[PDB]
Amino acid sequence: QVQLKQSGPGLVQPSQSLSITCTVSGFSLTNYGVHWVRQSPGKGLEWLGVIWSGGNTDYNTPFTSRLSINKDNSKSQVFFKMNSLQSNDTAIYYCARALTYYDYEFAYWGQGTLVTVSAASTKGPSVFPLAPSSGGTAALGCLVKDYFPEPVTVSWNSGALTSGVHTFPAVLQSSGLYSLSSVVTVPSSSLGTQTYICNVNHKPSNTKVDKRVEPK
Amino acid sequence: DILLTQSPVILSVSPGERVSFSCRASQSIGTNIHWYQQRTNGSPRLLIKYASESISGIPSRFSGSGSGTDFTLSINSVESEDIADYYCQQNNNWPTTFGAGTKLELKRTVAAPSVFIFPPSDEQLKSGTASVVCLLNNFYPREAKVQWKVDNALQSGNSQESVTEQDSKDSTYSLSSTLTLSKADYEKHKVYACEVTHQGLSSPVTKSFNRGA
C-alpha cells in the first residue's frame, strides 16, 4: 500500500543544516504532493511546507528563509533541508501525504525522524544484562546505558517476543547521556529451554548489539 | 494564524463510557477541521476529516461534529486501545495549524505492582559503575513510592525513576527505579533493598539481596 519511509535519526550541531530523505511507495510523486510536519516540545505540531506534483513548493512563513524541499520523481524521493538549526529546532520531523492531491488532510505519515540539535558528541550505549533469579514468573531485561542522542530501539528475540515487554522511557543522567531499561516477564520453566536476546540498535552511532540474558 | 484551543488538556474515563474532545478556533473556519490520534511512539493517525466525515479503516466508534468555531470529537464506547493524545487541525486559512492536544487516560481497578530487584552485572562492574534496578510491574494507579536502603542507610538523590505510558491492553503502568553507585561504594556495602509502597499493597513490599549471598 501507500508508505513513507524516512532516513534515520541523528545529531546536528548548532547553526548547521538538517537533511532528511523521504522515500515513498504505493503512489507517484507526480500525482501527489508531500508535506513536512514537525513536532517539538515547545510548539507541538507545526506544518513546515510542501512540494507539489508539478515541483512547486510552499514554505510556512517563519521558515521561508532556511527551508528547501526538492525531490526526484524517478527515485521516488523527497529531500528536506533546513539551515542554521538552534536548540529549539529539536523535534520529530515527519513527511506526510494527503488523501487528495491538492488537500491537507494527512492520511499517510512517515515514521518520523527525531532530530537533536546539540553540540555534544554521538556516543553508543553499553548493554548490560538484568539477569533473572514470583509464582513461576521470572523477570529479565537489558540495561542500555550512556548513549547520545535519543532514540534507541529495543526488540526481543528479533521481534518474536513482544508479550510482556516494557521498554522504559529514557532518562537524562547528570553526564548528559541517556539511559533506559527494557524488561520482559517469562515463565520460569522456559529459562532453561529458551534463549532471551535483547536486540539494541542506536542508529545515530551505528551501534548494534545483541545481548544474551541468562540466569547468573 | 488560526489558534485552535483544545480543552480540557487531560481526560480520564472508564471503559465503555462515552467521551468528547473539544477544539475551538479563534475565528470561524466552517467545517475545515481534521482530527488525529497519536499512540505511544506513533505517528499521527487521521480519524475524522472535515468535522464529521469518516475515514477508511477507522473504527466506527469515532465520530465528529461541529461548525463555525466549536468542534467535538466523540468516542461512544472507550476501549483500552484508545489511550493516546488527540489533536485537531484547521485548514480553512493558510497556513494549516494544529491544536495542542488532549490526553486520554483510562481508569481501571486497583492493581498491585509485582516487584523485582536486579543486582549490577559483573560486566558493568568492570567499568567502575554499579546500577541496581528495582522493577515495579503492571500496577494501577500511577502513584508509587520506591525507597532505597543500603545497609540501612537511606539513599537519596542517587536514583532515577522512569514510568511507561499506559498499556494499551490492561491499562497498567510499569516503573523502573535505578540506583547508581560507584564500584568503590558498591563494594563497601552488603545489603541492597528497594521498598515499594502502593495503594494495592496492604503493607510495603521489600526486595533485597546481599552482594554475593
Partner: peptide, 11 residues
C-alpha cells in the same frame, strides 16, 4: 502539557 520526544506522548 508538553510533548515528549522520547515517548511521542503528551506529558
Amino acid at each position: 502539557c508538553q510533548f515528549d520526544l522520547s515517548t511521542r506522548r503528551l506529558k
